[PDB]
Amino acid sequence: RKCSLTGKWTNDLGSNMTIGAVNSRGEFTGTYITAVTATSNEIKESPLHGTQNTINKRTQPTFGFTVNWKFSESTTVFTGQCFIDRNGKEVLKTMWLLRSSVNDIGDDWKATRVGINIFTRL
Amino acid sequence: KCSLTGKWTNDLGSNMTIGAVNSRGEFTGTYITAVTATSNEIKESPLHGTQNTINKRTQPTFGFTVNWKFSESTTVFTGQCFIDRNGKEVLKTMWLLRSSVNDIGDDWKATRVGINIFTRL
Amino acid sequence: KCSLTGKWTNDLGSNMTIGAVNSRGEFTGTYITAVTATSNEIKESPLHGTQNTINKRTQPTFGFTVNWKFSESTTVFTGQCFIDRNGKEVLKTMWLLRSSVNDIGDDWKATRVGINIFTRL
Amino acid sequence: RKCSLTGKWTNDLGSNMTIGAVNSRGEFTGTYITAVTATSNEIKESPLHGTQNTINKRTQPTFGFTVNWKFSESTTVFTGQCFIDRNGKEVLKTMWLLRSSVNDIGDDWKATRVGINIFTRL
Ligand SMILES: O=C(O)CCCC[C@@H]1SC[C@H]2[C@@H]1NC(=O)N2C(=O)OCc1ccccc1
Ligand SMILES: O=C(O)CCCC[C@@H]1SC[C@H]2[C@@H]1NC(=O)N2C(=O)OCc1ccccc1
Ligand SMILES: O=C(O)CCCC[C@@H]1SC[C@H]2[C@@H]1NC(=O)N2C(=O)OCc1ccccc1
Ligand SMILES: O=C(O)CCCC[C@@H]1SC[C@H]2[C@@H]1NC(=O)N2C(=O)OCc1ccccc1
Ligand SMILES: *[C@@H]1O[C@H](CO)[C@@H](O)[C@H](O)[C@H]1NC(C)=O
Numbered sequence: 357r358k359c360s361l362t363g364k365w366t367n368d369l370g371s372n373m374t375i376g377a378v379n380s381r382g383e384f385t386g387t388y389i390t391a392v393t394a395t396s397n398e399i400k401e402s403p404l405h406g407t408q409n410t411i412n413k414r415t416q417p418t419f420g421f422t423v424n425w426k427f428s429e430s431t432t433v434f435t436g437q438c439f440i441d442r443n444g445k446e447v448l449k450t451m452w453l454l455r456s457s458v459n460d461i462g463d464d465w466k467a468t469r470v471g472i473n474i475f476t477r478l
Numbered sequence: 479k480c481s482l483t484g485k486w487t488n489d490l491g492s493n494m495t496i497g498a499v500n501s502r503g504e505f506t507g508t509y510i511t512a513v514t515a516t517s518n519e520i521k522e523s524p525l526h527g528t529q530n531t532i533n534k535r536t537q538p539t540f541g542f543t544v545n546w547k548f549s550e551s552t553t554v555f556t557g558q559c560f561i562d563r564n565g566k567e568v569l570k571t572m573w574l575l576r577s578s579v580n581d582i583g584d585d586w587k588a589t590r591v592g593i594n595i596f597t598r599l
Numbered sequence: 600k601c602s603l604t605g606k607w608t609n610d611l612g613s614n615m616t617i618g619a620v621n622s623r624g625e626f627t628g629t630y631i632t633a634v635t636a637t638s639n640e641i642k643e644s645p646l647h648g649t650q651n652t653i654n655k656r657t658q659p660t661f662g663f664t665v666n667w668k669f670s671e672s673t674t675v676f677t678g679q680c681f682i683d684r685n686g687k688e689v690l691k692t693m694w695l696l697r698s699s700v701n702d703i704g705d706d707w708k709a710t711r712v713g714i715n716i717f718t719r720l
Numbered sequence: 721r722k723c724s725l726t727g728k729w730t731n732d733l734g735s736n737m738t739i740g741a742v743n744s745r746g747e748f749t750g751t752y753i754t755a756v757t758a759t760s761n762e763i764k765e766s767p768l769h770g771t772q773n774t775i776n777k778r779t780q781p782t783f784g785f786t787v788n789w790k791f792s793e794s795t796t797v798f799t800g801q802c803f804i805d806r807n808g809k810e811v812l813k814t815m816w817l818l819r820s821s822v823n824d825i826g827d828d829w830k831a832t833r834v835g836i837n838i839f840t841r842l
């Protein structure tokens with residue numbers, strides 16, 4: 357199969373994201389609803405934007421996107437690869453950086469968390 | 479007041495441009511890297527991202543994705559735009575560079591991480 | 600009561616042993632990886648690290664370094680030991696694999712990052 | 721020159737660390753005094769332990785170490801390479817993960833920060 361980004365996905369936390377169509381330059385838009393937050397705020401649905409790499413028209417492309425959170429001053433980016441898994445299902449295997457806002461450039465050292473996120477189609 | 483729009487460089491000698499940021503915090507840009515993990519000839523590549531506009535912070539967070547035109551890889555960057563008394567700006571960012579692998583059993587080795595600090599041209 | 604001492608495995612089928620932990624929180628262990636970024640034959644390698652004992656938490660953080668015997672690389676792991684209802688343990692860790700580069704100009708590409716979840720074997 | 725880990729180092733935060741002799745199995749011990757913390761706690765000098773890789777006895781070895789902080793429940797690991805810089809000085813280029821203690825497994829996702837640290841002698 358070719359692995360496509362377009363569709364509704366979910367992860368183990370129960371966070372969901374929807375990615376729209378991917379255009380000829382590899383650009384896509386979507387929305388992300390996170391299950392969990394580092395804020396003390398009400399979570400809202402937040403937009404994301406990114407690109408899939410189309411060099412050599414790989415069936416399992418890499419891609420990246422940015423989630424522009426609407427209830428926090430933070431930003432997360434994700435990057436990964438759209439695989440066909442051993443069981444034939446599409447899966448997105450990604451890593452992320454969550455950048456918090458700090459007040460002072462001397463506090464920049466602690467502003468970035470890292471992690472993984474694995475998505476399956478919902 | 480710290481704006482991402484401009485031409486930027488880092489110590490590695492890579493440059494990036496970022497254009498205007500629209501009311502939804504979106505922007506497009508270009509990135510010309512001085513270095514590569516590929517043995518391919520480097521080409522200028524496009525980037526796209528967003529600046530966070532919650533509470534209209536003067537030192538906003540942001541992220542963008544670089545869609546490399548000479549490899550199968552993708553890099554994302556996230557960071558913050560810092561600006562001092564004299565209006566001098568610095569973007570402090572961290573990145574993940576995702577390589578393509580052929581088999582999902584090699585996924586574990588596919589992601590590099592590092593920092594990039596940009597200043598204006 | 601989440602203890603690191605034991606034999607552990609991950610989904611790649613790598614295994615690790617960790618022996619007794621000191622009153623100083625030091626431990627020694629071994630790692631036999633299922634996968635390598637090198638083209639060399641894998642060999643069992645030693646590891647050394649510490650568990651944090653502050654407030655003697657039941658679910659302590661810890662870190663350790665694996666000194667690979669078949670490559671010029673080093674990997675460090677850091678995480679937390681979680682234990683459930685039935686006394687079932689899982690170590691959730693993240694790791695940086697540092698490759699050797701010959702020239703300092705190539706340092707930017709030398710560090711890979713990932714996760715590893717271990718269960719008792 | 722061969723790049724040696726043993727000695728007293730500092731970074732741009734003003735954090736200092738002292739590494740002792742490296743033994744024949746590549747092991748070393750030291751102490752770390754951080755300038756900053758992500759906690760609301762009082763900082764104290766803390767021990768570190770790690771190893772240098774001695775495969776092919778490279779003059780610029782990789783290494784890793786763990787700082788077992790004595791004033792928080794956190795752990796940081798650092799890994800990197802001891803280079804001789806273009807100017808002939810020793811420099812340790814490292815990256816780190818700082819693992820915070822979370823109370824529950826559901827919150828694991830947010831417990832790891834990442835960053836760089838570059839050290840120079842004295
Ligand atoms: O707090 C803010 O400032 C804004 C909101 C940030 C939400 C973060 S983005 C990374 C993480 C969180 N949500 C999510 O789905 N993540 C994620 O890592 O999911 C994958 C996962 C699955 C199972 C277990 C752990 C992580
Ligand atoms: O090879 C591929 O597959 C595609 C090309 C990947 C290019 C990588 S993206 C991160 C790194 C490299 N270029 C660059 O400017 N980076 C960077 O880290 O420079 C940042 C820097 C900032 C401040 C000081 C020193 C270096
Ligand atoms: O090549 C070298 O230079 C020296 C050897 C490096 C081995 C690396 S250390 C991190 C990674 C690899 N082995 C392992 O068990 N890891 C690991 O990530 O396992 C966790 C895992 C579990 C399921 C799926 C993917 C990863
Ligand atoms: O808080 C806790 O939970 C326990 C203590 C953690 C101390 C952290 S470990 C990584 C970081 C901090 N200190 C330090 O020297 N680091 C560091 O990154 O310094 C390098 C640096 C130099 C200049 C600018 C930014 C970073
Ligand atoms: C994910 O979508 C599923 C099914 O539609 C829903 O039950 C779940 O609550 C959603 N997660 C969030 C964070 O909204």
Ligand SMILES: *[C@@H]1O[C@H](CO)[C@@H](O)[C@H](O)[C@H]1NC(C)=O
Nearest residue numbers: 487491492493510511512513
């Ligand atoms: C960045 O711009 C400078 C000055 O214009 C130029 O000399 C340098 O070659 C550019 N860097 C790259 C990687 O093209």
Ligand SMILES: *[C@@H]1O[C@H](CO)[C@@H](O)[C@H](O)[C@H]1NC(C)=O
Nearest residue numbers: 608612613614631632633720
């Ligand atoms: C892990 O241990 C099992 C035996 O328990 C063994 O079959 C497997 O080969 C080990 N993995 C490696 C990489 O040695």
Ligand SMILES: *[C@@H]1O[C@H](CO)[C@@H](O)[C@H](O)[C@H]1NC(C)=O
Nearest residue numbers: 730734735736753754755842
């Ligand atoms: C670093 O060492 C210097 C003495 O050379 C000292 O002034 C400074 O406060 C030390 N840093 C810390 C965090 O104690």
